[PDB]
RNA sequence: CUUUAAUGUUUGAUGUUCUAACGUUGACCCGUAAUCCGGGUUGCGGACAGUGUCUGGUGGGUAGUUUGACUGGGGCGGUCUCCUCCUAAAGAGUAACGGAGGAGCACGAAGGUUGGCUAAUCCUGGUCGGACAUCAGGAGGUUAGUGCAAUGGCAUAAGCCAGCUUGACUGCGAGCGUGACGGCGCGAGCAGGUGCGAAAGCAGGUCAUAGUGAUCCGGUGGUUCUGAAUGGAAGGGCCAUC
RNA sequence: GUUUAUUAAAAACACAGCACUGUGCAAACACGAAAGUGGACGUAUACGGUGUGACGCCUGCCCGGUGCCGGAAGGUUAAUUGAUGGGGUUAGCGCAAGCGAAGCUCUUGAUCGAAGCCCCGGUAAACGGCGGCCGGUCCUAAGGUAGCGAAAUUCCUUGUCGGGUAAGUUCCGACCUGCACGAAUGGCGUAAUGAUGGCCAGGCUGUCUCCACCCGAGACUCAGUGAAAUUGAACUCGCUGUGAAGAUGCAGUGUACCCGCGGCAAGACGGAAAGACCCCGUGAACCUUUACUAUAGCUUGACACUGAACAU
RNA sequence: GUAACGGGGCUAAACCAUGCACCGAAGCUGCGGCAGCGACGCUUAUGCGUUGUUGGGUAGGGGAGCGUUCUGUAAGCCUG
RNA sequence: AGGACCGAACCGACUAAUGUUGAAAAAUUAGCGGAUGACUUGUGGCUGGGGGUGAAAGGCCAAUCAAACCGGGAGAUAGCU
RNA sequence: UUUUGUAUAAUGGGUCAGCGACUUAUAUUCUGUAGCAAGGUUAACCGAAUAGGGGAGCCGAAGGGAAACCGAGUCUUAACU
């Protein structure tokens, strides 16, 4: 980053933002991962068992990515509108 | 130089203010103008402050 | 006593007669209105002439004072 | 040893989807009365680092 | 409960006295046939002196350093950022300690809009009137004016005058120009709300181009975005601003 | 007398003398985290520091500035102490915006608080300073006195006049328009002393006109032993030109049979030392100071060690 | 040291104009060879009767190799 | 009597020549200053490097001194050759 | 060698022989190559030890926003053509 004594880009531009501690414990679940779980029911503890999310993740949210082709039960996880439609199109269920 | 900075504060209580300058020596009367307040989305009287 | 100058302003005709222009392109940058504006040409606050419609640049001389006008002809 | 991130750059830049870096604009911190509202409105959004500076930013942010 | 007399009584203070802390590089005894040290007796000082922590002043005694660059060597002098002209070779751009001048502001009207208007100079006649004050007409046609340099512009006036006003608005912005970059600049048009005009429309400051300072640290107003067990709060972010 | 051992011996240092100043003895001061030691087994006729530097005549005026010393009405001022205010939290009340005791808590900072600095006076053998104006007056702290002066000090300058020489930028004497002397960072003289600076004279001379001859040690030859610096390679001439700009080496031309020895130093930008001058490097080291930031030491106060009575 | 045609020398062997000829380079053509970059037709892990064209080079970038010691291949092969 | 005088030893070092790959990393020859004093000299001891010592020249402290020598941090750093 | 420029009278080398200078470690990005492929791969460790186990982890398949948050969208804005 040295520029011959000209004030470099990183010192020339301002700082912005802050780092959230919620983000490190939030995670994202793709639709492909819903069938990798064992038992057919989807939840934080069973996803952790199936190694989809880390041990320290406390919050998860299913998103429309991939395909789901089996009935699946979701509990205790947020779900996007598209992921909700995709889950319910395959005879699934979503619970809060 | 002489001409000092002031703010014109909304009379709608939104806390919105414009910022301008004024020559205090000549024309010392407080400035007052109808300006647009975006918090309430109306034209409102703004009064000199600071 | 004479070691001073100002940064050159890059003024002049940026887009010449007959060339195609998209709307909003500066035609000429100028101190004062050396070129005036005609059809589909707007004058800016610093007298910049820009195209208000997509077309082709045309130069002309009009009026009693033989003043130069920039117009945009819709292609 | 691991490369050490330059933490000032870690605070000044964020990586985007395609690989570019976003940043906040300079000249929007403290002499704001004399500046036109158009200028400040255009400075407020974020911007993408340019080609000439991409190499320097990437050197500074190895783990971005 | 208002006020006001005193002391046992708690620390504040001045003073004087005292001895038991503490000092003695006073005397004598002992350890001890020893100008050290220690103990002891006695005298002289005495809560002073002096030492520890904290604190204001002083402090080249000592220490660590800084004391620019350009530059027809270096130094002394000058300069260093911005705007106008010329050099600059009829697009842009273009150097020298090349030739000449300015800026580091101003204005809530000197901004916006509607309506209206047209200068300098001279000639002639006319009270105080002079070469030059106001008036009347004539020639003249911008030789004026522009808030401040210069260049380029300006009569549809961008110059002058008056009425109403706050668009010196908020979010955005097709598309362009100019920069290595940081950035700078112009911009039709869309949403909101507004001023003037019967209306068409004009208005996102001023005839244009100088009037400026990145980042970090921090101060103020707003914003429940975050808030380290939980609820707050501190602190941080975002917006406006110093 | 001493001094830069190894380019400087002196006008430099020291010195007897003198002045100021500090020091009352567990002295000041110094070496020492300290104990202790020197000062000194001394005691103001002593000891330290500082300056000047025998002796003779002397040593003028100024305390405005810096320093030191003394004294003080008052101003500001640290640590410590913590009056009052503001905010967070929650008991509670609230058909609720919201209010909000106590406790803990963040923040403000009333009051007390020494020296120092501000102010007054002294001190120049402390650091230092010492006029103009018109033929009385402004300014200042005071306006250079005595003595000396082209000087170890005088730029113009080889100042002017004189002495000495045929001829004297040197020397001696006088002068005074002292660029830019001056009185203990001493002024002016001074007999004696000096491997001290300058000038003049007698004597003496190979210093010189101008060199000659001679005696020894090398040089030269012979026998023995046997270095050094330097060195890209050499079949290593002159001139005129040219050329990274001063040619043995290029171009043109001239001269030149091969090789030693004794000599001399014009060139080989000869050898020796990565120039010491100059400049540069955000190089180094030392020294200075009212550069900055610190700090030892000194000094002020508060708390601890640290108590009792008494009076106001 | 001639030293202001490079020299000799030149009254042209100087200058002007006009002609035809010759010399003259690592330029161009001729003959033989090497390499690269392409495009081509037979053809295919391609090369060629072919064809056009390229081939000075510092800093530097890219491609392909030679050789040295050591390890396996290797108790193999060579060697009194 | 004398920090008196001339002058050997002894202590020094003013001038000149030589020498400068020296006889010698400071000397030789000829002259030269002091030479009873603040003299000189032998033996032993003490003062140590931001320190000593200095009749003071930044002099001397083992041929080294505007901060000795040895070992270490250490392959300091060198935008320079 | 260094330079705009060196036969240069600019540096370096007396000659020979031997030695003498882009390395190693760990990260990270790109290129070639090999395996696997919406998957890829293990570290320490165990282990009769280059096997095999070990998926703790790491990168990838989802981005936007300072963030909560939303999500093939999201942010900006009261809202975007």
Q: Are D30 and D43 in contact (CB under 8 A)?
A: no
Sign of CA dihedral D48, D50, D51, D54: negative
Residue ranges with strand state E in A1-96: 26-30, 41-42, 59-63, 73-75, 78-79, 93-95
Residue-range domain boundaries for chain C: 11-75
Sign of CA dihedral D35, D36, D37, D39: negative
Q: Are C28 and C35 in contact (CB under 8 A)?
A: yes
Residue-range domain boundaries for chain D: 1-64
Nearest chain D residue (CA) to B19: D33
Please state how this structure was obtained: cryo-EM
Whether D33 contacts chain B with CB within 8 A: yes
How far is residue D64's CA from residue D51's CA, in Å, rounded to a whole number? 17
Terminal Cα distance for chain B, rounded: 18
**CATH 3.20.20.20 for domain B1-50:** no
Which residues neighbour B42 within 8 Å (Cβ) at sequence distance 6 or greater?
B12, B36
Residue owning tokens 């006593």: C1
Query: Residues by CB within 7 Å of nucleic chain I, which ones?
Result: A 16-18, 20, 22-23, 26, 28, 30, 32-33, 51, 54-55, 59, 61, 63-65, 78, 80-83; B 38, 41; D 1-3, 14, 16-17, 22, 45-46, 62-63
Beta bridge partners of C43: C49
Instruction: List, edge to edge, every strand of the sheet that includes A59-63.
Output: A26-30, A59-63, A78-79
How far is residue A47's CA from residue A41's CA, in Å, rounded to a whole number? 9
Q: Which two tokens stand for residue C40?
A: 């589909």
How far is residue B34's CA from residue B44's CA, in Å, rounded to a whole number? 5
3-state helix, strand, coil in chain C (%, to 5): 0, 40, 60
How far is residue A68's CA from residue A90's CA, in Å, rounded to a whole number? 7
How far is residue A51's CA from residue C16's CA, in Å, rounded to a whole number? 66
Residue owning tokens 């050490």: D4
Nearest-nucleotide field for A31 (CA, C1'): I61
How far is residue D41's CA from residue B38's CA, in Å, rounded to a whole number? 14
Q: Are A73 and A64 in contact (CB under 8 A)?
A: no
Residue-range domain boundaries for chain A: 21-94
Contact A16 D29 (CB under 8 A): no
Helix (H, G, I), strand (E, B) or coil at B9: strand
Instruction: Name the residue with the least CA to C1' distance from nucleotide E84.
Output: C6
**CATH 3.40.50.2000 for domain A21-94:** no
Helix (H, G, I), strand (E, B) or coil at A12: helix
Q: What is the DSSP letter of C19?
A: -
Terminal Cα distance for chain D, rounded: 17
Q: Which nucleotides of chain I are near protein (any atom < 7 Å from a CB)?
A: 25-28, 38, 55-58, 61-73, 76, 78
């Amino acid at each position: 980053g040295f520029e011959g004594g000209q004030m470099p880009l990183y010192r020339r531009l301002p700082k912005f933002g802050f780092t959230s501690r919620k983000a490190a414990i939030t995670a994202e679940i793709r639709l492909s991962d819903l069938a990798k779980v064992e038992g057919g029911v989807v939840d934080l503890n069973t996803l952790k068992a199936a190694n989809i999310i880390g041990i320290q993740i406390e919050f998860a949210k299913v998103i429309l990515a991939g395909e789901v082709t089996t009935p699946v039960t979701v509990r205790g996880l947020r779900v996007t509108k598209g992921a909700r439609a995709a889950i319910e199109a395959a005879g699934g269920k979503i619970e809060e | 130089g002489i001409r000092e900075k002031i703010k014109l504060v909304s009379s709608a209580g939104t806390g919105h203010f414009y910022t301008t300058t004024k020559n205090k020596r000549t024309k010392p009367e407080k400035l007052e103008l109808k300006k647009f307040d975006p918090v309430v989305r109306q034209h409102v009287i703004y009064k000199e402050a600071k | 006593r004479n070691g001073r100058d100002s940064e050159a302003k890059r003024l002049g005709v940026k887009r010449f007669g007959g060339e195609s222009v998209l709307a909003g392109s500066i035609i000429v940058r100028q101190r004062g209105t050396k070129f005036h504006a005609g059809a589909n040409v707007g004058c800016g606050r610093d007298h910049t002439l820009f195209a208000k419609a997509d077309g082709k640049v045309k130069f002309e001389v009009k009026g009693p004072k033989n003043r130069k006008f920039i117009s945009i002809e819709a292609e | 040893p691991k490369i050490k991130t330059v933490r000032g750059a870690a605070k000044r830049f964020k990586k985007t989807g395609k690989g570019g870096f976003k940043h906040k604009h300079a000249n929007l911190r403290h002499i704001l009365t004399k500046k036109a509202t158009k200028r400040k409105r255009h400075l407020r959004p974020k911007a993408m680092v340019s080609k000439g500076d991409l190499g320097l930013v990437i050197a500074c942010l190895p783990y971005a």
